[PDB]
Amino acid sequence: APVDYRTDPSQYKHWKLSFNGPVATLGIDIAEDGGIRDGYKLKLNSYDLGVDIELHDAIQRIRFEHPEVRTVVLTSLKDRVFCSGANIFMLGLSTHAWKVNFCKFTNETRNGLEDSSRHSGLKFLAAVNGACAGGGYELALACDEIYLVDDRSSSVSLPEVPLLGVLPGTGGLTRVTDKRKVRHDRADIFCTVVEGVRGERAKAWRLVDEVVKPNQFDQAIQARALELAAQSDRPAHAQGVPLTRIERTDREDGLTYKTLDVTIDRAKRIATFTAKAPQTEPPASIDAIVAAGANWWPLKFAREFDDAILSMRTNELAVGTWVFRTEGDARHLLAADASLMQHKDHWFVRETIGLLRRTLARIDVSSRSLFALIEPGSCFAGTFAELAFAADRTYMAALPANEDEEPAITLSEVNFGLYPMVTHQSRLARRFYEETEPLDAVRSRIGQAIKPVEAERLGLVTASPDDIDWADEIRIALEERAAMSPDALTGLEANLRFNGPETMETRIFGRLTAWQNWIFNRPNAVGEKGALKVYGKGSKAQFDVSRV
Amino acid sequence: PVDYRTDPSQYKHWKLSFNGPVATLGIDIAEDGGIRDGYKLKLNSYDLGVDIELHDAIQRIRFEHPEVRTVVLTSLKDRVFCSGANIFMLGLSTHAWKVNFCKFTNETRNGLEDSSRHSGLKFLAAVNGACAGGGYELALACDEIYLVDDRSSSVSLPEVPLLGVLPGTGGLTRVTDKRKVRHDRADIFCTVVEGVRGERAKAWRLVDEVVKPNQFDQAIQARALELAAQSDRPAHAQGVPLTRIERTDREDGLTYKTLDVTIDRAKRIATFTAKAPQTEPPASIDAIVAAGANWWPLKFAREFDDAILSMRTNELAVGTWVFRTEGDARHLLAADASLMQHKDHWFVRETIGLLRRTLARIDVSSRSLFALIEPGSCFAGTFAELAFAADRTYMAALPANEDEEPAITLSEVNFGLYPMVTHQSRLARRFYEETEPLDAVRSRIGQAIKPVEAERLGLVTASPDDIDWADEIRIALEERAAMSPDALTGLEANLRFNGPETMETRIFGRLTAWQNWIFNRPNAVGEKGALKVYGKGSKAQFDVSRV
């Protein structure tokens, strides 16, 4: 069945949230009977996609509904286990595509903790009591600090290689090196043994930040939480903004939201996303923005778009091309952007910018081809122009015989750094290789309605076919997209979009994930006699011992 | 088994011509000269054997031709420059064969750029006919690309639409990182078979100049001379002949003058024992030049490169390499001192370059690497790189016997003379460029560091006592043989490359790992996949679903 990423705390099976002044406590309490797919139990706080769907929502709730909260303590509500990682039985029963989506989404949820540490005024403290293994340690890694109980029952481990024949692929290796700076040969030992590291050795090797005896642990966690809270600028007095349930109509051929249509052509294998500008001028003043809350256009659009991206990634694997279109009045988009820029220091506007940033950042790493079609009547302006700059190709409709009807691309300040991709660059900076001449040229033209011929001349679009050439040029490009191997297209896209600089996050989606994917498609890990499927059976996994 | 040793008298596929400062390297591939059976190499398409000759030819230019300053790469076939890796050969190759072929060919091309930076050479691709796929990937690694403007000859990367694979020999990474082709233009370029010709190829940044056929040869020679003026190579020096590499092929390994490889097939371990100069190597430049190919640092570099290539290619099930050393550290340090003192001399610089490129093959090899530092060893200077390249390094503590206890001795060469493909020294990578631990080891240059200090400084993984050594090392090796090789290679690709990325790490990382995933799936390699339908007049059958 299809996955629905919509949930709320009243529905959580796996997490408890509680609030005590500036400290939120997020308790891991996974329901063993609560698997999102069938055929497995989730024992010992092991997890699946459904657990992460709830985790993603819980962080969203803290971000938007709890402005007065400054630190989040992540802790287990189970005896003897913090988190035992991605459920091995679940992995063994999953298709290749399901695993790859599961890795990608869980990676984005974790990247999101760090995103909020940078940009939301939040800090995350992992309070680790009991076994913290594999994905358990990968989650702790994404926190700002990790405190470990100093007793025999408490350890950190990454048993994936020796136990499962796979990597710590939820960013584990990349955080061990890039974030913790664990010396690589020590990391090798850590990643090639099942028995966990404890106490002062874990701290000495840089795997955790502090270790505390059991009788002092709770007090130490709370005191550190308050120290981390002092780093924040979040308000001492503010009511939160409830994230109301997203209204969505599911159709055989797509999805309907207030701010977004998705229409699927199953024969052509194309999903067309039509993003819709604010229907009326959005509020300029902070009091009206806050009062609008989840009905404030930039937040509403971010939420609906994120839901659509996640739904289509997960539930529509054969529909390999996404087309981006827009409709509405560019003046209302530009007014929205002006309010984002003016009020960007305000906690709520800042949080909303954060969700837009994270949501758009899902696009560049999605395994779908991306074409933006800038047709007459569209409104690729400001935030919406990011849909052009994210795309593999952008075509814009020239009308030599009817120039007054030509569409325009209109840049705003948001296109110059407000929504970095995971390379940390704006999409335009990536587009022009950070070259100052073409970037200066378009910066000079912020706010101008750039028409098709000029947009092509400035390099803002791939081509601007006229009304005679348009139909065939776009149809043929889309036919070719459907006819080529999806494997080759996704690989090509992963290299062309990430056209130079690397960061911890590009390494997570690149070097780490691509190696994991190759491992995931081979019998040593996933075969009937492989490491995942023999787990718990008392038998020896059979490996092809040859190197590649 | 593959033998990587060859020489110009044996070439089937290349012609070298020497005209003063300009060497012409002519592509003239023998259709019947495939290294494996079952395919012809038509229209200057290539296989591993073609690249083995190319690698040798560049080596000959480097060492035997101090007078050469520019290398013109061109085709001796009409109509075609190079049509890329042979598609029939790809369809007939195992997964492991393809992955090794991509890796070796990538290193050959990275080596052109390595010499452009460090040898005083420049490479000019004179593209005088169709230049497709691997053909364009080779041109990309040159310093400049000149395309004949003849209304026909084109550059193309048809791999995606035609083969269902990527331009995996650095093609995509050079298109973005080196040529700076706007990514959406690159997308068009990489998803059309016919490619691009004439002025548009220049405008899109795919080539540097286009010249009409009646002026082409003149323009190529003129530009070659201009690129030659940049060099400091000495026009009046004699070359150093690269004589044969003596090697005994045994059932259980390889014997070279400066290196033993011994294979334990049951344990799946190959032990490389590198040997120091047997006596003090020459300090003077004249004596170094007179020794030539027999000069220890060059001899060792060549033998070690041959062994790495041989073991990578011919011994797939032997997943762990153990590095040991033997001989006298004083002689190693004397060799290093000569390298540092004379590094501006063309021949010494060239030898440093081969050591650099050879060591740089280690970090990207799909084998686990353990360095064992035991009594009698000499992990000193250049040889200490074998410890710093390793996934783990164990050093034998002998608290009750100091004479027998080994030492690590650093020299200047450990601080940047031999960068891995991240551009870092192995020690800089090891310590995440942290100044405290690096200062602590640099200040001990030239000193014999004993096992306890070595472990405290973080230069080794562990220094086990002699009653703990046998079991600790044996268990680590048993575990290495028992774990999945797929997971180990992936692990090693992430832990060795522990932060910074470069164009070369992107070639071996982002680009190659995606290629490898594609290579292991039926859309590309299935009986009715893209490679195998080629030329058949049928349509590939694809699973259409994205991952």
Give B180's contacts in chain A (Cβ within 8 Å).
433, 435
CB within 8 Å: A547 and B489: yes
> DSSP label at A420?
-
Task: Tell me how crowded residue B340 is: count the other CB atoms within 10 A of its CB.
Answer: 15
- B523 in contact with A at a CB cutoff of 8 Å? yes
Six token digits for residue B540:
């590939």
| E strand residue ranges, A382-527 | 393-396, 409-410
Element (H, E) at A286: helix A286-292
Q: Which CATH class is domain A254-483?
A: alpha beta
Give B479's contacts in chain A (Cβ within 8 Å).
162, 192-193
Q: Is A46 helix (H, G, I), strand (E, B) or coil?
A: strand
With contact defined as beta carbons under 8 Å apart, do B252 and B265 qualify? yes
Closest partner residue to B515 (CB to CB) among A174, A491, A521 is A491
- A189 in contact with B at a CB cutoff of 8 Å? yes
Distance from CA of A41 to the nearest CA of B (A): 25
Q: State CA A345 to chain mean position distance.
A: 23
Q: How far is CA B102 from CA A293, A511, B89, B170, B171, in A?
A: 54, 17, 13, 9, 11
Quote the CA–CA distance of A334 and B138 in Å, as a whole number: 47
Quote the CA–CA distance of A129 and B110 in Å, as a whole number: 49
Q: State CA A209 to chain mean position distance.
A: 26
Which amino acid type is present at position B179? R
Quote the CA–CA distance of B534 and A403 in Å, as a whole number: 46
With contact defined as beta carbons under 8 Å apart, do B487 and A519 qualify? yes
Please give the CATH topology (third level) of the domain spanning B1-252+483-547. 2-enoyl-CoA Hydratase; Chain A, domain 1 (3.90.226)
β-bridge partners, B125: B73, B145
Using only the alpha carbons of chain A, give its radius of gyration: 24
* Cα angle: A263, vertex A268, A270; to 5 degrees: 40
**Residue owning tokens 């490389």:** B272
Quote the CA–CA distance of A113 and B34 in Å, as a whole number: 54
Residues forming CATH 3.90.226.10 domain(s) in chain A: 1-253+484-548, 254-483
Q: How far is CA A543 from CA A108, A546, B344, B481, in A?
A: 32, 9, 50, 10
Quote the CA–CA distance of A18 and A3 in Å, as a whole number: 27
Nearest-CA neighbor of A236 among A347, A344, A343?
A347
Quote the CA–CA distance of A201 and A208 in Å, as a whole number: 9
Which amino acid type is present at position A454? E
Six token digits for residue B530:
């893209």
Nearest-CA neighbor of A194 among A145, A147, A232, A156?
A156
Quote the CA–CA distance of B517 and B105 in Å, as a whole number: 18
Quote the CA–CA distance of A114 and A127 in Å, as a whole number: 17
- A510 in contact with B at a CB cutoff of 8 Å? yes
Torsion, Cα of B308, B309, B315, B321 (10° steps): 10
Residues forming CATH 3.90.226.10 domain(s) in chain B: 1-252+483-547, 253-482
Nearest-CA neighbor of A391 among A367, A416, A364?
A364
Closest partner residue to A547 (CB to CB) among B316, B461, B509 is B316
Q: Which CATH class is domain A1-253+484-548?
A: alpha beta
Q: State CA A77 to chain mean position distance.
A: 26
- A544 in contact with B at a CB cutoff of 8 Å? yes
**How would you label A463-486 residue by residue, b for 16+ Cβ within 10 Å and e otherwise?**
bbbeeeebeeebeebbeebbebbb
- Determined by which method? X-ray
Q: Enter the resolution in angstroms.
A: 1.5
Q: How far is CA B26 from CA A321, B13, B124, in A?
A: 43, 9, 12
**Can you count the helices (H) and strands (E) in chain A?**
22, 20
- Give residues 432 to 471 of B whose Cβ lies within 8 Å of A: 432, 434, 458, 461
- Tell me the H-state helices in B119-154: 134-141
Q: What is the DSSP string of B7-21?
A: -GGG-SSEEEEEETT
Report the first-to-last Cα separation within chain A, whole angstroms. Answer: 37
> Residue A31: exposed, middle, or buried by beta-carbon count in 10 A (0-12, 13-18, 19+)?
middle
- Give residues 243 to 282 of B whose Cβ lies within 8 Å of A: 268
Quote the CA–CA distance of A265 and A269 in Å, as a whole number: 6
Phi, psi angles (nearest 5°) of residue B368 = -70, 150
Q: State CA B542 to chain mean position distance.
A: 34
Quote the CA–CA distance of B371 and A465 in Å, as a whole number: 61
β-bridge partners, A211: A148
Q: How far is CA A296 from CA A30, A60, A224, A336, A345, in A?
A: 34, 16, 36, 9, 17
Quote the CA–CA distance of A274 and A315 in Å, as a whole number: 19
Nearest-CA neighbor of A154 among A123, A120, A199, A121?
A199
Reduced 3-state DSSP string for A133-183: ECHHHHHHHHCCEEEEECCCCCEEECCHHHHHCCCCCCCHHHHHHHCCCCC
Half-sphere exposure of residue A151: CA atoms within 13 angstroms, side-chain side: 13
β-bridge partners, B209: B146
Most B CBs within 10 Å, among A98, A316, A370, A487, to test the B interface? A487
| E strand residue ranges, A258-328 | 260-265, 270-276, 321-327
Phi, psi angles (nearest 5°) of residue A240 = -75, 175
The length of chain B, given as a count of residues: 547
Quote the CA–CA distance of A214 and A220 in Å, as a whole number: 10
Quote the CA–CA distance of A371 and A373 in Å, as a whole number: 6
Quote the CA–CA distance of A215 and A24 in Å, as a whole number: 22
- What number does CATH give the domain B253-482? 3.90.226.10
Quote the CA–CA distance of A150 and A209 in Å, as a whole number: 12
* Cα angle: A364, vertex A368, A372; to 5 degrees: 70
